[PDB]
Amino acid sequence: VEIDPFEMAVKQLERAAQYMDISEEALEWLKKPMRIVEVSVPIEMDDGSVKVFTGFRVQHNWARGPTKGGIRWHPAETLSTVKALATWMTWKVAVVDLPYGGGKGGIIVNPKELSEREQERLARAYIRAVYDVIGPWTDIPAPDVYTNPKIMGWMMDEYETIMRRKGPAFGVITGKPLSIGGSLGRGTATAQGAIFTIREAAKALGIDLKGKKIAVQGYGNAGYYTAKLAKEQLGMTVVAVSDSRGGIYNPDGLDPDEVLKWKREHGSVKDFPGATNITNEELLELEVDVLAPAAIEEVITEKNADNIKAKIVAEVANGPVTPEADDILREKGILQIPDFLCNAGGVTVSYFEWVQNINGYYWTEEEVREKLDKKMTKAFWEVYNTHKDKNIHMRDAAYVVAVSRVYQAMKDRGWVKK
Ligand SMILES: NC(=O)C1=CN([C@@H]2O[C@H](COP(=O)(O)OP(=O)(O)OC[C@H]3O[C@@H](n4cnc5c(N)ncnc54)[C@H](OP(=O)(O)O)[C@@H]3O)[C@@H](O)[C@H]2O)C=CC1
Ligand SMILES: O=C(O)CCC(=O)C(=O)O
Numbered sequence: 001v002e003i004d005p006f007e008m009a010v011k012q013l014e015r016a017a018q019y020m021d022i023s024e025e026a027l028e029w030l031k032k033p034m035r036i037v038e039v040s041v042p043i044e045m046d047d048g049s050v051k052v053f054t055g056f057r058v059q060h061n062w063a064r065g066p067t068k069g070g071i072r073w074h075p076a077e078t079l080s081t082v083k084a085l086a087t088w089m090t091w092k093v094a095v096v097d098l099p100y101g102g103g104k105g106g107i108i109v110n111p112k113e114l115s116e117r118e119q120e121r122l123a124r125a126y127i128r129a130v131y132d133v134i135g136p137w138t139d140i141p142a143p144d145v146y147t148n149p150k151i152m153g154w155m156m157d158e159y160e161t162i163m164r165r166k167g168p169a170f171g172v173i174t175g176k177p178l179s180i181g182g183s184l185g186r187g188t189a190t191a192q193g194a195i196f197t198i199r200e201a202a203k204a205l206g207i208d209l210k211g212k213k214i215a216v217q218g219y220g221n222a223g224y225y226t227a228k229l230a231k232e233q234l235g236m237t238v239v240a241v242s243d244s245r246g247g248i249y250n251p252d253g254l255d256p257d258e259v260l261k262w263k264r265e266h267g268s269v270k271d272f273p274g275a276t277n278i279t280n281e282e283l284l285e286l287e288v289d290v291l292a293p294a295a296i297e298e299v300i301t302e303k304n305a306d307n308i309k310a311k312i313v314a315e316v317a318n319g320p321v322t323p324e325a326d327d328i329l330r331e332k333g334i335l336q337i338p339d340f341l342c343n344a345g346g347v348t349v350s351y352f353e354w355v356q357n358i359n360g361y362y363w364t365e366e367e368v369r370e371k372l373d374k375k376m377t378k379a380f381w382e383v384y385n386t387h388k389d390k391n392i393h394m395r396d397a398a399y400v401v402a403v404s405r406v407y408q409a410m411k412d413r414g415w416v417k418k
């Protein structure tokens with residue numbers, strides 16, 4: 001990464017607090033995670049040896065309620081990345097008005113080198129390590145990069161075993177399989193929220209999205225579903241997709257299902273029939289109408305900020321654009337959906353699932369879809385009007401919408417007097 005993920009996040013927070021009335025003590029409180037837990041996660045490998053990984057559970061603030069955030073399994077992960085993600089989580093849950101704080105977890109591991117049994121052991125050992133700081137009313141993890149509902153169910157089972165079934169164990173973690181307390185629409189949650197935000201942004205810009213072009217970076221749970229929903233709901237034409245090994249571009253358009261099948265049968269989207277192999281750098285520079293980065297953070301910097309040619313940049317990923325790059329893009333007249341507003345659908349449906357678990361009652365697809373649409377539209381329009389009234393960068397406006405709420409919570413708790 002170009003710069004430290006946490007330093008960048010703090011930079012953004014200050015840059016955006018320059019447009020609002022907030023006390024110095026509150027800013028100092030908000031620039032530091034409230035609790036960080038670094039743990040050793042020992043598991044037994046398939047050959048019988050014991051290997052110790054490094055796990056992080058960072059909650060940045062819980063003024064508004066129990067902290068929420070996914071668990072990332074990544075070899076390149078660092079504690080700074082988890083801190084930045086928890087900080088972004090805070091604003092993410094504040095902007096769509098959820099009774100959550102901000103949290104994040106992670107393990108420095110390459111899951112592609114682990115078997116099924118090793119992955120289950122890793123999840124259970126991580127739960128055993130961080131049990132003392134998580135709970136249905138303390139900290140609610142969720143799926144993230146290289147984690148899936150399978151691992152979520154393993155973690156929930158381990159937590160329930162430790163907790164001796166005293167309370168709503170199903171609510172300790174979200175993104176679970178439907179059989180063990182799952183939620184309908186959670187699989188396509190972040191993609192649905194991103195699609196709703198893109199539709200609202202096009203409405204604001206007066207652009208008909210039918211027949212237009214979308215380029216998606218990353219083909220995971222968010223990128224693939226974003227491409228599929230854009231092709232299906234918005235009528236867009238997916239011209240290029242990518243994963244860590246490279247991307248495929250096609251002027252005539254790609255079918256997301258065939259690309260996903262090829263990726264599953266080959267390991268990557270590279271060399272897909274009828275498409276041209278390109279790099280992620282080349283995909284980011286393509287002439288498209290919507291660009292959706294749904295991969296690792298910090299993909300747009302001063303090394304390519306001026307080469308972006310998309311009308312709308314939908315930051316599906318967490319912090320994919322640097323503040324400098326934000327300034328360059330805004331100078332270029334490119335509308336940006338802020339990272340913690342565009343992909344707030346995923347946590348929006350995660351909040352729904354938590355409510356369904358603690359209540360003991362479950363809803364349907366239509367209710368979840370309706371509530372998610374309502375929440376995402378309200379949050380996006382709040383941020384848009386905020387940035388329009390104050391004549392500031394989108395990113396900043398969302399902060400003004402988010403941080404203020406968090407700020408209010410502290411003033412309602414007595415944490416900060418001013
Ligand atoms: N996970 C979630 O539920 C949510 C996560 N987010 C945020 O979004 C981002 C993506 O999450 P998600 O879609 O679930 O990821 P996934 O866990 O579903 O899978 C990761 C995908 O992105 C690819 N990828 C990782 N790094 C790069 C890279 N440097 N360049 C190109 N492709 C890369 C992977 O490639 P390959 O398959 O080849 O390994 C894979 O295709 C994260 O930052 C996450 O925090 C937002 C909403 C909710
Ligand atoms: O769904 C959740 O609770 C966490 C969402 C998440 O991991 C993210 O927004 O990066």
Ligand SMILES: [N+]
Pocket residue numbers: 092190343344345346347348
């Ligand atoms: N989310």
